[PDB]
Amino acid sequence: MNPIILIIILMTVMLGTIIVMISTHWLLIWIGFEMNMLAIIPIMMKKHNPRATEASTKYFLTQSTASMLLMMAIIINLMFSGQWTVMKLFNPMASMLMTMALAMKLGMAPFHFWVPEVTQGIPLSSGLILLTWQKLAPMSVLYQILPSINLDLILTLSILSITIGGWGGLNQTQLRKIMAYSSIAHMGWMTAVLLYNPTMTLLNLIIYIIMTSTMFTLFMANSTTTTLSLSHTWNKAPIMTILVLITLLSMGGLPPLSGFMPKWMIIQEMTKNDSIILPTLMAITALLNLYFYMRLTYSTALTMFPSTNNMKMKWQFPTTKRMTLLPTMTVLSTMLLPLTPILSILE
Amino acid sequence: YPTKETAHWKPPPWNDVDPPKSNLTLNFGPQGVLRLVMELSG
Amino acid sequence: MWFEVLPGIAVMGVCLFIPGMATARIHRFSNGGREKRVAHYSYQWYLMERDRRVSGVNRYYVSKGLENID
Amino acid sequence: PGIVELPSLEDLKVQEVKVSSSVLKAAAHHYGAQCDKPNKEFMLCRWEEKDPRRCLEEGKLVNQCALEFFRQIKRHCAEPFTEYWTCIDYSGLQLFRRCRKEQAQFDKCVLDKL
Amino acid sequence: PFFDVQKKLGVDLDHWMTIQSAEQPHRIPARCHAFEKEWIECAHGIGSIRAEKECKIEFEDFRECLLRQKTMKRLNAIKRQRDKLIKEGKYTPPPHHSGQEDLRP
Amino acid sequence: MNLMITLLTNFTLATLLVTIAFWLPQLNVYSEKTSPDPMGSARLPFSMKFFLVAITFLLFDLEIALLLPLPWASQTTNLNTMLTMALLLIFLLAVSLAYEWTQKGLEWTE
Amino acid sequence: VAAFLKNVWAKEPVLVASFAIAGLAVILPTLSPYTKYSLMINRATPYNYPVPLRDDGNMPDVPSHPQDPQGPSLEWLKRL
Amino acid sequence: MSLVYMNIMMAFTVSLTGLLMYRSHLMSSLLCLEGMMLSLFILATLMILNSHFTLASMMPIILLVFAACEAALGLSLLVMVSNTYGTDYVQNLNLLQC
Amino acid sequence: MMTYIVFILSIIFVMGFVGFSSKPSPIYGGLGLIVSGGVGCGIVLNFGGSFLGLMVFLIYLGGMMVVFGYTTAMATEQYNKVVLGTFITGLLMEFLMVYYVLKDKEVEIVFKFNGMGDWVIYDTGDSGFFSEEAMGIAALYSYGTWLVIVTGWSLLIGVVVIMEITRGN
Amino acid sequence: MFMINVLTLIIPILLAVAFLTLVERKVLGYMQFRKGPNVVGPYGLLQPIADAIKLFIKEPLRPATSSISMFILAPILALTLALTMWIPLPMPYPLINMNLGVLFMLAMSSLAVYSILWSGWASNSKYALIGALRAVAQTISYEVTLAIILLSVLLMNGSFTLSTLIITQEQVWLIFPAWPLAMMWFISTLAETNRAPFDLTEGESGFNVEYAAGPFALFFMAEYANIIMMNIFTTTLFLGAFHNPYMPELYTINFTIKSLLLSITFLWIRASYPRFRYDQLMHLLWKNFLPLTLALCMWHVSLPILLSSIPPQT
Amino acid sequence: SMMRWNRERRRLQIEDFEARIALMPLLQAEKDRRVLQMLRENLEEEATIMKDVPGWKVGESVFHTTRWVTPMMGELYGLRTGEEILSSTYGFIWYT
């Protein structure tokens, strides 16, 4: 791919997301979603492998069904309201259709089946672009329509996403599938608090974006795709293993790291509304996310798996990858707890 | 945690590239006169 | 010589002159000896319906003149 | 909810202007020039009241004044107007440009007689 | 998040197409201009909760103009009762509803 | 009603002619033929060029659909904006054509 | 520059003609003094009804009759 | 609501159920998706033309063009699948189960 | 029975959908989609949308379904119970809705549907010397600057994407 | 009464295409130093009748088609879209007066390729399928250039009504301000109907070779009706005649003479040039015709604005 | 030549349009009286049909406001013949 064409395609993705974010018309939301899908399709086809083609086909079919359901919801709201302003919807059927459309777009369970599939078949940079940038626009659309969101449906989707993400990440050996199931659990966390306080949804979105960016940047820097190469990383560079141990510690919500910051705040907005069973259940389920993070830290940094003879050659060459914002994202994702009230800038 | 169902599952290749798993041939008959056997590539 | 191709062109010209003449004569016959009214917009159709409703025959082509007023 | 207030059939009765569309289009410009005041008053009443039932009497004035137009055509300029509206009535699109000489004769008779 | 770029920058990108009572080419009015106008001038600046609990009358009127549920329900009732009385023989259609009216103009 | 009548007349004349052409010499008595082309045994190989010109036609057809209402749009009051948007649409069409030209898109079906 | 232009006029006259026509089309409306005539021709077409205004008492510029001298004129369109 | 609204919504529903149950091919599912888009087009333009929404008449054409562009993209993906396994069967797209 | 013409057309429309929702073959599915597109163009023709109906005929049928069948001819090589079964099932439910809404004149599945004709909800006015839908589309350049910009950029990006992803290198 | 008008429209089409086959044979023969048919009838006037009766009593091929529905349906659609496409023609008054007759004709032009596609698919020979794919690609490419040229010419006209083209050409012809568009439109309509030098199936296979004598005859009738109507469309679009509302026969005779001359020009072009290659005609469209079409489209968008020459909507 | 003829065509078009806007008020008044007559006839028929049905008020508006609402086509031609309905609601669309 040409650098100019790749740059133009990336700005097209950014323009589509911005168009969804800044528009006050439903047709422009739909237009931005199609812009985003059409411009992100070739990034998944960067290597021209059969797995990339199948992943792009599955992503295309799921996004097409989601966009068509979104247009059906827009048309129903047009009929029953006579206007296009992006605000609360004026039909429960249109609200339900739009909610399941955005759940299919975000990868919420039980529409999650493409997320561990697709992320396995695409490169690491494209998977990072997916799992971080593609989740901004549907979360904005969910933010704007929360007066019409059914509570039962969104809480069912949240608990299903958290449980299925934990039980799915409990099994994998590949890193990309682990990050996919972790993403599913995290969006269950973010949507569980949406109807009570969306500022916590914004805070959890930002923290999840920083953590996923740090982990994917570490994986790109070490060129690791399975757990065994991540185990091998201890011989080549120990500082990378220390960084992935600290980041995986923070991703599990272990205090005093910054990953304790979102979910705890979420509990603080759900015991105010006298809902005690749900946050306790969600923390108990997120213990499984902590479990497979602990398994990864056991394999990587807390022990030393055996290495090979050719690794000695890799001792003679310094790394030359542009590890952009890796120290900043490592610091920001782990020592951000003593600046917890800064979330008030998102209110 | 392998079970009976996921017993034949192989690990993905390290480069994530699978093995890739023809020339068209035409026969123009005698329908002066000439029979041509042509091999094309598109 | 070259003019022996002219009977075929004459037959084709007759066959192509037939539909236009037939359409013009049918339009003049079926609309009171005048051109068929063109209703491309809703205002012209409203005018045509007003003539049909004012003729008393339920035929728009029977135009009532100044004799129909007091 | 409420009951719709509707005028009786005696309030809707008036002497109609029973002419065709080509008759009206032949004398449209002179009708606009001469019968301007009741037409403008009726249209202002319609656009301000936003209700036909509140404008009915004004509408009656139109159906009076326009009739007083056509009678003045019938008394003085019947034949050139007859020729002009027939020439307008022939064509399918009722074009003004196909009837220039009859329009000129009708306008000359109207100007020198009215 | 909804970043109001348009209101901050003063530009107009899609506000002309959001509602139905907006400025139209050749000032062509829609069939429910007045109802939606009244609903909009009610619900302006009072919030969604007060908008949905305070002028439900205007929103019901606008929805009735939009979809005409009650109008065709009343028409169904009238036509059904007319058909029943026609079958029972106690009603006949007047001549002006049969096609011999010699209408107004 | 006139257009539907004309469509039905054309359709019924077409199927009458097809039925006559397909069944009139069927009533004649003749002798049958055995069940048996240069590529009978060979499979059809895929060619990327025909699919490429098909999708190029589809995209240019969509931009043609966008460009179509210009005769109605020329009667507007914002003449500067209409002229700018029309020229921008045709310029983007030409830019797409030139970019397909430069990247060897129109090769061997030029 | 002149050698390049003669070269492309030698090899590809079609592209040269197309680019010349496109450049003329894109620079000529900004120079012709007849665009404003198009603008006020499109403005002067009466698609809608000129609904009258209620006379409050002080409107000297608006006319009272269609044939009054007040209001806009159309002699320029009649002559051009 | 009107009768044609029920018929168009039922058409959208049966095309959605046709999409969600793959039989053998992928072209058939793509055709089902374009049928869904066509039903959306018809419903939107019926609602728009019924209520005399003047400006909104610009909308369904866009609803065509964008979605039609998407259809082209889908076709290309199918061709890529046809370049790998020689057929557009959906039972060859299972390389990512492990 | 003439006054239900649009409704009658709508029946064929949903019937055509069962032509390709059962998915018999891409050629027969394309034929069913062609019939459905023509019927939908007739439906929007009966509502006054002439330009949009000819958009359906010019761009959907003659533009996009041509490419769909053209790519179909490069697959599904030439030479069931389930296809006929779901066709019969869908036809039976469709005629059940037809019979019920023609019987009691008011049904419901998700929304309340009325059993009268389509002619009731029409407008009694006249549009004047223009077609309202025609000027609504014609306002694409005068009003829809942003829509034109994003659509043109989308089509250009789509051209780039299409010729990029099928290179294979 | 209206069905009489429909029949008087559609039966002279069949008579005209039969005698167009006769006129083609005679004019083609006289241009290469020989005669056409002059033995069967007086100057060969009975030749199309003999050809029709011969073709309708020949034994049908009965090919081993994969599908019989497409095999039947392709002549159905071909003849239907050949005959339906004549109705909005203003000669000087159309059968069906429509607001968007140009768009209607363009829609049927785009829709006519399904006969080629279904004929190629229904035949069991894959070489016929390849030929049908190439013909479809050629037709849709020249459909694109036809649409752009028609858009620019109608932007000069100002409305999609086909009868307005007579009014807008009262002073001067549109071949005087739009002769490059006229030339490119003529070549595009030549390449649309698989006419020489743009036919490919005759040279080195055909898509309709597997059809019987009857269906081949019906395909021939559809193609020749398309040729005649396309010439009539070019005559109406660029070479409009003087129309008198009191004597329509003047316009009828005038445009009949002009369209006859254009059809003779089609046959004249057939007997002058060698056949194009497929990639050569793709090169002619995508690299020569399309840039000039886009440039002239920009020019005709901007020209009425800068000249105060915007035509009326009505 | 085209610019000269197009300017003349624009002048003729605005002449026709000004004739139409001169003719508008009479047609507006006629349309108002016609729709009021149709609504009155429908009201009388509803009065003589619904004398038996309990809980029915003759002429009950379906709107909470007292503002005049333009009559929907089914409210005008509800009790008329089929051919009048067809000519009123599909006469313009089906006219060639």
CSV table of N, CA, C and O in Angstrom, one decimal, chain J residues 18 39 50 106 127 170 182 188 194 204 214 219 250 291:
chain,number,residue,atom,x,y,z
J,18,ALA,N,-38.6,-5.3,-41.1
J,18,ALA,CA,-38.5,-6.2,-42.2
J,18,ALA,C,-38.0,-5.6,-43.4
J,18,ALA,O,-37.0,-6.0,-44.1
J,39,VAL,N,-34.8,-10.6,-57.4
J,39,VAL,CA,-35.4,-11.8,-58.1
J,39,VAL,C,-36.7,-12.3,-57.5
J,39,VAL,O,-37.6,-12.7,-58.2
J,50,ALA,N,-40.6,-13.8,-47.7
J,50,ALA,CA,-40.1,-15.1,-47.9
J,50,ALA,C,-39.1,-15.5,-46.8
J,50,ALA,O,-39.1,-16.7,-46.4
J,106,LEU,N,-33.6,6.1,-21.1
J,106,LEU,CA,-32.3,5.6,-20.5
J,106,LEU,C,-32.4,4.5,-19.5
J,106,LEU,O,-31.6,3.6,-19.5
J,127,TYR,N,-18.2,-20.6,-23.9
J,127,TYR,CA,-17.7,-19.6,-24.9
J,127,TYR,C,-18.7,-18.6,-25.2
J,127,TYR,O,-18.4,-17.4,-25.3
J,170,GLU,N,-36.6,25.5,-32.3
J,170,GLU,CA,-37.4,26.1,-33.3
J,170,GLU,C,-36.5,27.1,-34.1
J,170,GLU,O,-36.7,27.1,-35.3
J,182,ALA,N,-22.7,15.7,-30.4
J,182,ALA,CA,-23.5,15.0,-31.5
J,182,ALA,C,-22.6,13.8,-32.1
J,182,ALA,O,-23.2,12.7,-32.2
J,188,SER,N,-21.7,6.5,-29.8
J,188,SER,CA,-22.1,5.8,-28.6
J,188,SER,C,-23.4,4.9,-28.9
J,188,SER,O,-23.5,3.8,-28.4
J,194,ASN,N,-24.5,-3.0,-30.8
J,194,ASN,CA,-23.6,-3.9,-31.4
J,194,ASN,C,-23.5,-3.8,-32.9
J,194,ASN,O,-23.6,-4.8,-33.6
J,204,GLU,N,-14.2,-13.5,-34.4
J,204,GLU,CA,-13.6,-14.5,-33.5
J,204,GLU,C,-13.2,-13.8,-32.2
J,204,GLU,O,-12.8,-14.5,-31.3
J,214,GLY,N,-36.7,-19.2,-34.9
J,214,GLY,CA,-37.7,-18.3,-34.5
J,214,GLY,C,-37.2,-17.3,-33.4
J,214,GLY,O,-37.4,-16.1,-33.6
J,219,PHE,N,-34.9,-11.9,-31.8
J,219,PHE,CA,-33.8,-11.1,-31.4
J,219,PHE,C,-33.4,-10.1,-32.5
J,219,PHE,O,-33.0,-9.0,-32.2
J,250,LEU,N,-46.3,17.8,-41.7
J,250,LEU,CA,-45.0,18.4,-42.1
J,250,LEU,C,-43.9,17.9,-41.2
J,250,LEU,O,-42.8,17.5,-41.7
J,291,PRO,N,-13.0,11.5,-21.0
J,291,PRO,CA,-12.4,12.8,-20.6
J,291,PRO,C,-13.1,14.0,-21.3
J,291,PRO,O,-13.4,15.0,-20.7
